[PDB]
Design an enzyme around this catalytic site. Structure first.
Site, PDB file in Angstrom:
ATOM      1  N   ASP A   1       0.826  -1.204   0.000  1.00 14.31           N
ATOM      2  CA  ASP A   1       0.000   0.000   0.000  1.00 14.31           C
ATOM      3  C   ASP A   1       0.864   1.261   0.000  1.00 14.31           C
ATOM      4  OD1 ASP A   1      -1.848   1.988   0.409  1.00 14.31           O
ATOM      5  OD2 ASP A   1      -2.812   1.014   2.153  1.00 14.31           O
ATOM      6  N   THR A   2       1.084   1.824  -1.183  1.00 13.96           N
ATOM      7  CA  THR A   2       1.937   3.003  -1.271  1.00 13.96           C
ATOM      8  C   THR A   2       1.298   4.241  -0.665  1.00 13.96           C
ATOM      9  OG1 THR A   2       1.171   3.405  -3.559  1.00 13.96           O
ATOM     10  CG2 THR A   2       3.218   2.157  -3.246  1.00 13.96           C
ATOM     11  N   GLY A   3       0.013   4.212  -0.417  1.00 11.96           N
ATOM     12  CA  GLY A   3      -0.684   5.308   0.232  1.00 11.96           C
ATOM     13  C   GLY A   3      -0.669   5.252   1.747  1.00 11.96           C
TER      14      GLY A   3
HETATM   15  C1  LIG Z   1      -5.053  14.768   6.003  1.00 13.03           C
HETATM   16  C2  LIG Z   1      -4.542  13.561   6.758  1.00 13.03           C
HETATM   17  O1  LIG Z   1      -5.590  12.975   7.453  1.00 13.03           O
HETATM   18  P1  LIG Z   1      -5.292  11.612   8.322  1.00 13.03           P
HETATM   19  O2  LIG Z   1      -3.998  11.736   9.009  1.00 13.03           O
HETATM   20  C3  LIG Z   1      -5.274  10.160   7.143  1.00 13.03           C
HETATM   21  O3  LIG Z   1      -5.315  10.675   5.841  1.00 13.03           O
HETATM   22  C4  LIG Z   1      -5.159   9.622   4.864  1.00 13.03           C
HETATM   23  C5  LIG Z   1      -6.355   8.673   4.596  1.00 13.03           C
HETATM   24  C6  LIG Z   1      -6.219   7.530   3.564  1.00 13.03           C
HETATM   25  C7  LIG Z   1      -4.913   7.343   2.819  1.00 13.03           C
HETATM   26  C8  LIG Z   1      -4.798   6.164   1.791  1.00 13.03           C
HETATM   27  C9  LIG Z   1      -4.935   4.865   2.604  1.00 13.03           C
HETATM   28  N1  LIG Z   1      -3.835   4.875   3.590  1.00 13.03           N
HETATM   29  C10 LIG Z   1      -3.963   4.676   5.009  1.00 13.03           C
HETATM   30  O4  LIG Z   1      -5.023   4.510   5.522  1.00 13.03           O
HETATM   31  O5  LIG Z   1      -2.727   4.704   5.724  1.00 13.03           O
HETATM   32  C11 LIG Z   1      -2.796   4.646   7.212  1.00 13.03           C
HETATM   33  C12 LIG Z   1      -1.859   3.871   7.636  1.00 13.03           C
HETATM   34  O6  LIG Z   1      -0.516   4.778   7.410  1.00 13.03           O
HETATM   35  C13 LIG Z   1      -0.869   6.028   7.687  1.00 13.03           C
HETATM   36  O7  LIG Z   1      -0.451   7.013   6.532  1.00 13.03           O
HETATM   37  C14 LIG Z   1      -1.553   7.296   5.860  1.00 13.03           C
HETATM   38  C15 LIG Z   1      -2.788   7.055   6.904  1.00 13.03           C
HETATM   39  C16 LIG Z   1      -2.403   6.063   7.745  1.00 13.03           C
HETATM   40  C17 LIG Z   1      -4.719   3.596   1.784  1.00 13.03           C
HETATM   41  O8  LIG Z   1      -3.603   3.785   1.008  1.00 13.03           O
HETATM   42  C18 LIG Z   1      -5.971   3.334   0.905  1.00 13.03           C
HETATM   43  N2  LIG Z   1      -7.085   2.938   1.829  1.00 13.03           N
HETATM   44  C19 LIG Z   1      -7.492   1.518   1.723  1.00 13.03           C
HETATM   45  C20 LIG Z   1      -6.526   0.636   2.611  1.00 13.03           C
HETATM   46  C21 LIG Z   1      -6.918  -0.853   2.492  1.00 13.03           C
HETATM   47  C22 LIG Z   1      -6.634   1.090   4.112  1.00 13.03           C
HETATM   48  S1  LIG Z   1      -8.398   4.041   1.773  1.00 13.03           S
HETATM   49  O9  LIG Z   1      -7.867   5.547   1.672  1.00 13.03           O
HETATM   50  O10 LIG Z   1      -9.298   3.769   3.091  1.00 13.03           O
HETATM   51  C23 LIG Z   1      -9.397   3.647   0.344  1.00 13.03           C
HETATM   52  C24 LIG Z   1      -9.134   4.304  -1.004  1.00 13.03           C
HETATM   53  C25 LIG Z   1     -10.010   3.912  -2.187  1.00 13.03           C
HETATM   54  C26 LIG Z   1     -11.135   2.836  -2.004  1.00 13.03           C
HETATM   55  N3  LIG Z   1     -12.191   2.227  -2.989  1.00 13.03           N
HETATM   56  C27 LIG Z   1     -13.006   1.276  -2.261  1.00 13.03           C
HETATM   57  S2  LIG Z   1     -12.512   1.236  -0.776  1.00 13.03           S
HETATM   58  C28 LIG Z   1     -11.360   2.230  -0.689  1.00 13.03           C
HETATM   59  C29 LIG Z   1     -10.479   2.606   0.524  1.00 13.03           C
HETATM   60  C30 LIG Z   1      -3.702   8.291   3.107  1.00 13.03           C
HETATM   61  C31 LIG Z   1      -3.838   9.421   4.138  1.00 13.03           C
HETATM   62  O11 LIG Z   1      -6.473  11.366   9.449  1.00 13.03           O
HETATM   63  C32 LIG Z   1      -7.814  11.224   8.997  1.00 13.03           C
HETATM   64  C33 LIG Z   1      -8.583  12.524   9.263  1.00 13.03           C
END
Ligand SMILES: CCOP(=O)(COc1ccc(C[C@H](NC(=O)O[C@H]2CO[C@H]3OCC[C@H]32)[C@H](O)CN(CC(C)C)S(=O)(=O)c2ccc3ncsc3c2)cc1)OCC
Lengths: 99, 99
Positions: A25-27
């Site tokens: 997960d690069t995100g």
């Molecule tokens: C402004 C900052 O706000 P913030 O700090 C957090 O912001 C963010 C929010 C989300 C992301 C991208 C997600 N990364 C992530 O959750 O990473 C966490 C773990 O590592 C940390 O770094 C990043 C956050 C922490 C994942 O790559 C992708 N996800 C799925 C996976 C399986 C979980 S998805 O987004 O749920 C998603 C996308 C399309 C889709 N189509 C059908 S389902 C579905 C679900 C980056 C930053 O607090 C919240 C207010």
């Protein structure tokens, strides 16, 4: 290896001696795994995702093998929808995006 | 190009005639962008990740340009904390993971 993205990039990992399946997960900044028993000290931590924040157990300096590549780093355990390998470990195994 | 993962893999995109920054996110099935008034019809949808679900508007057959590479597919618009380019579009620009 070169991994295309037509399917979810799910790989086998070995952690705590047990095999699991996880998403590259690069995100994700951080690696987050579903509830499991891990040996070692841990501290309470919070992490935010797309839907808000969750409570996790932070394990430091954990050995984890990802498709045969070794990494040693931070692993968060908590109610994630799926096991995710984040950039903290992707960088250790030399992973890049290419297009 | 080749994008290392030391930092978040952020890129400039062009969508709906506007420039935005978004993450190249192999962990996202679908593409999710911040609130923006796209013309045309849409369908309500809920997408889930860490922390729970958010409500988004699903637009189909939307043109996006990613670092010079054009792609066309479904884009979800809603109160997401970050913009992510998901696999539905990453496959179109020929993006792979390599380690
Ligand atoms: C402004 C900052 O706000 P913030 O700090 C957090 O912001 C963010 C929010 C989300 C992301 C991208 C997600 N990364 C992530 O959750 O990473 C966490 C773990 O590592 C940390 O770094 C990043 C956050 C922490 C994942 O790559 C992708 N996800 C799925 C996976 C399986 C979980 S998805 O987004 O749920 C998603 C996308 C399309 C889709 N189509 C059908 S389902 C579905 C679900 C980056 C930053 O607090 C919240 C207010």
């Amino acid at each position: 290896p070169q991994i295309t993205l037509w399917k979810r990039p799910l790989v086998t990992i070995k952690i705590g001696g047990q095999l699991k399946e996880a998403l590259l997960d690069t995100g994700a900044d951080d690696t987050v795994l579903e509830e499991m028993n891990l040996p070692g000290r841990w501290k309470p931590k919070m992490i935010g995702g797309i839907g808000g924040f969750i409570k996790v157990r932070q394990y430091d300096q954990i050995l984890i093998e990802i498709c045969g590549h070794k990494a040693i780093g931070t692993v968060l355990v908590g109610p994630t929808p799926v096991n995710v390998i984040g950039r903290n470990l992707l960088t250790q195994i030399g992973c890049t995006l290419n297009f």
